[PDB]
Design a protein around this nucleic acid. Sequence first.
RNA 1: UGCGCUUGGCGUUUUAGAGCUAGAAAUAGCAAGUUAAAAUAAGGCUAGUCCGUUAUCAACUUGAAAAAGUGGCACCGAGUCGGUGCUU
Lengths: 1360, 115
Amino acid sequence: SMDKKYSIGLDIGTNSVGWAVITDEYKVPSKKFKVLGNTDRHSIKKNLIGALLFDSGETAEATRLKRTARRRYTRRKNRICYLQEIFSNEMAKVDDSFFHRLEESFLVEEDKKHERHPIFGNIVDEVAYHEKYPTIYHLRKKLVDSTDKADLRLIYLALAHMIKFRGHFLIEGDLNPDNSDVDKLFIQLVQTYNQLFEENPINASGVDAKAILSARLSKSRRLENLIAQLPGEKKNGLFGNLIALSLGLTPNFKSNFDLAEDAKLQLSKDTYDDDLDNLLAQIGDQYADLFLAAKNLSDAILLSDILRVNTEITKAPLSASMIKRYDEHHQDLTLLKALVRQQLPEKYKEIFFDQSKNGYAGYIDGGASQEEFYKFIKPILEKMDGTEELLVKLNREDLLRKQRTFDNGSIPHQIHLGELHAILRRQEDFYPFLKDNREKIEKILTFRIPYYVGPLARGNSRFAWMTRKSEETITPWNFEEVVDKGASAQSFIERMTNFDKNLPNEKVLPKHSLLYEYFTVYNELTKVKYVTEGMRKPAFLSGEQKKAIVDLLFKTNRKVTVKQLKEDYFKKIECFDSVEISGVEDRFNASLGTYHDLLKIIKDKDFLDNEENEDILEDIVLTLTLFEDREMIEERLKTYAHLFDDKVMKQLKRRRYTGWGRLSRKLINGIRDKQSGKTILDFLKSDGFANRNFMQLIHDDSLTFKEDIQKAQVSDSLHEHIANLAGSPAIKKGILQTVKVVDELVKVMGRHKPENIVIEMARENQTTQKNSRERMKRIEEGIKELGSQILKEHPVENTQLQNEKLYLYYLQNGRDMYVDQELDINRLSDYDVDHIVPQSFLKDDSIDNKVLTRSDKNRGKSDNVPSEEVVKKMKNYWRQLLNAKLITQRKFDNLTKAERGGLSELDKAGFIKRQLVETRQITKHVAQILDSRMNTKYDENDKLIREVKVITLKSKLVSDFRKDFQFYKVREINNYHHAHDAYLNAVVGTALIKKYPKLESEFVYGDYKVYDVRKMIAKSEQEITAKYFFYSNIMNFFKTEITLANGEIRKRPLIETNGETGEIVWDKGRDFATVRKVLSMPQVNIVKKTEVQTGGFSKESILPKRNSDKLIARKKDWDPKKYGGFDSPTVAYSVLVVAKVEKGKSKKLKSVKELLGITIMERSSFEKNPIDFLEAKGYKEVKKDLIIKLPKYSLFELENGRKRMLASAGELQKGNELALPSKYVNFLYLASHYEKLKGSPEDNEQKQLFVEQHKHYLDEIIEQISEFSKRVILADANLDKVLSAYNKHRDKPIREQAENIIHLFTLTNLGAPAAFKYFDTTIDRKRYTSTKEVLDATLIHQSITGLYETRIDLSQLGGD
Amino acid sequence: TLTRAQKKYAEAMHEFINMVDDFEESTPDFAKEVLHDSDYVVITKNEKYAVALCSLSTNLYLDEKLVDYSTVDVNGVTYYINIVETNDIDDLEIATDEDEMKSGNQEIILKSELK
RNA sequence: UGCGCUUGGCGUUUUAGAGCUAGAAAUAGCAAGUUAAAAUAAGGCUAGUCCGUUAUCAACUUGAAAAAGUGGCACCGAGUCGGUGCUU
């Protein structure tokens, strides 16, 4: 051969990139490759196919949380330092070393440089103090109340404990009823509820919420007493579950909103936040204000229950109430011990003495939670007399409570400030320096760094944007006069705006932009259809209808129901009687919330509607979204003070907003259509008979928006190029790894660019029955809408809803879809499932396109959609199902196409688009880069010369192709299929680009002549000349004989060719062989990208002290034998070390060749001075040349082709892949698919014969595995154990025997060994814990493809 | 926001309700540090503690190290949410009766976490 | 769909809150518990009320680093890649 034309295949992933090279003949070439190294092998052959594997790429966010965690702790340490500094000069007078003792509180007696008692320094004064002040709160109350001069250390402690743990800043300004009281926040709740629900208000005008909620009763009682005042609210209503949430319970919002999956929400859960976001997404942004009014109430109750004081007894409600809790804990404990001595004295020791148990000892000493604890003593209290009071406190959750606890989130820094402020005012006469710093101290507590200002850096922080006003250290006092608040904010706005993906360089609107809201309503409104009597076909809205509706319904309602639209407008305004509506269901999702919010506060309807006020109005929203901050908001509304009352103005700033949209104002209006001068939003309003939608407008190539977007994505350097594209961080790594592979391959190929690069992107997102509930949910609501008794008569269960025949039975209400016939639920095996739009026209296997009939003959004689007769007979029946949502609209239409003359050219041209064009925007970006990288030359007119055509395929075509021709895939076997998939794309892609070149525009990146598809299409079968097809399914030319919807068989020639070129595209007999050949090849290049670990030094569990020296100190001086520490430290990379070390009492140098794990923490050190580091860690006579870096997954080959991968310094992973013969592959596919075949009956039987006639392949397969494990896995005990186990079930079914044969592959799988089972029987993994063999073994360095290697025999080290 | 490990557990938690008893006492989470360090989350039903199964290195020794578990209660019976910490190589023990324990335990789910 | 800024409550760790009676001890009987300090990636220099867990990484060669370099082809096979005519 001569042919140096070649195309490349690629299957891009998050953990893999399969790649292949092919020739014009669909062959995978073969080459010898220069093998560098010190071994004797100086070249080997490799097939040009393989796949790169790699650990996923991880998000920054994880690091961010660590960063703020770190920032918080550092700036708390500074608060205290501001205190001590003020105190210190005076304190020195009173105690020389008082602060110092605190500094060293942590340390053991042996290491303290001062006296071991911290506050006072002698055991007498200390022990006294603790009997006098059992908590800090006793000290705080006394200082807050008393009129005596107090010791200056004690004043410090009190103040330092309010400052250190200073509570929340959720509430701005002084506390008052509207921000802190339980009733007010109750009112805001119902107000938020009714705003949502004008139709069904709650009125609670008489209702006394404060008292009901506040009183000391179990959460669940208070919930009943409240719903008790609200007739027409159910205890688990939407309003009832909202109070439940408010009390801290776990309500299920499932029923409340008709959800498929339940929505249990609990305010104390950390995951509540995105548990809420889970619910919100389903039910929309609108309800967020409810759950936030619930949350604030939640704070209000908890805070109400923490401060249990009558005020004015003390200026320290908090401390006084903790003391109460202390006393109460004492009382109740004493009694309890009484009641256990008396009644259950055998259990006294365990409960109060054992810290292993969940009893009191574990509660205090064993780290039990309050929750674990109650649940321990609950049975025990219940067994005893005299527990009545204790059970009440328990079930109220008020028994034996500690003062520092999970609740205190809800304690506002203002309260702390109250006590802080009091103590100063008592003492400031006894200590003038406190009079003089009173305002400084209070500032230490109350000052907060602004959200906008950010880190207070000086040019050494990548994160910070703040601008100084002077070069001096920033302190909470000088802040306003050192930091340029305005400038710093301004740089804030710029950084925290995201740009429009479609049109970057342009900021995204706030999610609550009136314009974003008008836009979003006009987009939903544009797809709505209606029928009055004599309605012709189902009509769209006029622009004038739309502009009246928004004017009447939308600018009069927060949310508009169909009923108002059906009744409020159609009957009322157009003087209709009854109007069917389609294209919306139940109610509108998008409404002008921001219009109504602004109407309430501004009470000037003309102003909102002026539409020249839009600018003023859009800046407003912009500031209330940008800023939480009260001060800034005031500064930033200053210039609309004239326009508005000081009643409204105040009320304005009290409206806040959160969230950003996907789009730019310039998107929605700024750009225009060249031909029409109509913006996007301009089209949404009036588009005529043809009523386009925003997604359409961008896609629609007849307009200037699609093209300007393309022209607008403009972005230089590489990583910047990679960085820019949207998509997950893991997929950016794969895109980057893809392009490197292409570069290596091009290099491999002589630096010739290929003819084409076929792309597809593999999907590995099989998260879960998410869909199996929805199936049931669809049926219930469906079967209820129809008022049928089917589910009663035939029991419901949603897991057997995975049998499609069973699924369609129910969706059709137990009837034939093509006849007024019942089906027999039992006898479904007999029935045929039919595709409405035949397979020949397009490949659609969706339930949407399938129906159950007693025999597919009932459909009609056609090769079309079903016959005009069936349509006219069932259309009513089908209409009922559609109104009941058992069938989709598209499905109704498809059945009823015959009515409309059946499948048109336009229909067909649509199936073609459907099949070719890749819908995911991220592959297009991947295409652009590669096209950009590959194509570099311009011609003599400055037209780009496209030497390489970069093609993107839907994954489906290949996946369909494998299924169609029996090139089956079973991931559980090995990793080759990644590479195979790439090959198969390359093949299917190039064929297609030969056979249909005019279709290039659809599937080739570039700018090409767009061709009306219809022209391609033939009007008839006999028409077949320059007509591409009469049958839509574009993959037809591969098949020899295709079946039509009516059993007829249309044949095709072995040798297809493009008619116009005459180029030869496919020999059906010859070419498939080439494919089968490629797939069964044993040598495929599987490279695990080796990686140095990065991140945390070790596990994050601070452990208690051990003799063992493994644990790692948390501060250089803190010996873990004394102070505890971290246990396991991550190894960054290992390092082969060859040196001689002392071996016995003699101290004689024995030569060693060892493997050393360099911890992430040690890396710095060892990488500055590698020998010195190694020498301090014991090795001597180290040889510098010898040392080799060995990261994770480093590859060794042992004797007999056995290979290992380095997991750590002491452990290996299996390094071999099991290329099973192709014949056993499809055997194991079919076998384990035996029942749910999803194929036509006559071959669905044909394949089952093949399995029954090849059950001797089962035994042949085990011996495949057997010889493999003996040779490489070398875990004999396990293979013995399975070898018996397959004997033990040789007579179990082939579908069961196979499906377990697939688990067994874990044993031979590449990577670390895992535990697995055959049937009941379970195999324990055999771990390769010796890295000794490797040292004398052969290393192998691989390029990305694994094609260029360097082989290093390690048994030649040990000498000179 | 949310711990990388934590999030891959919360979803793990969804799947267990997916088994479904509409149990009604809401599921508990261990401290973030325990979760990052711990390698695997397993739930064992029918009132028995999770896992601890051996691994025979190149006879058999214990492989999986436990941490805190919560006896969440379905209408009938305790379902522990046992948390399993994968074992570091040097540290290991040798099992006795336990091989019997691994065989006679039925566990509804095991989900990889760190990965 | 990323990426970013403020701030809290727990939690964990060590110390500090004189344990007593009886007994040679082994040990048993009792008392007590609710709080605080401190650290919260070791640390780093650029000394900031900054920064320290993301991306990135075969080997060998040049560079200070971005970055640049380094490995014929044809056929006939196929148990992880084998052989052979040719090129040099």
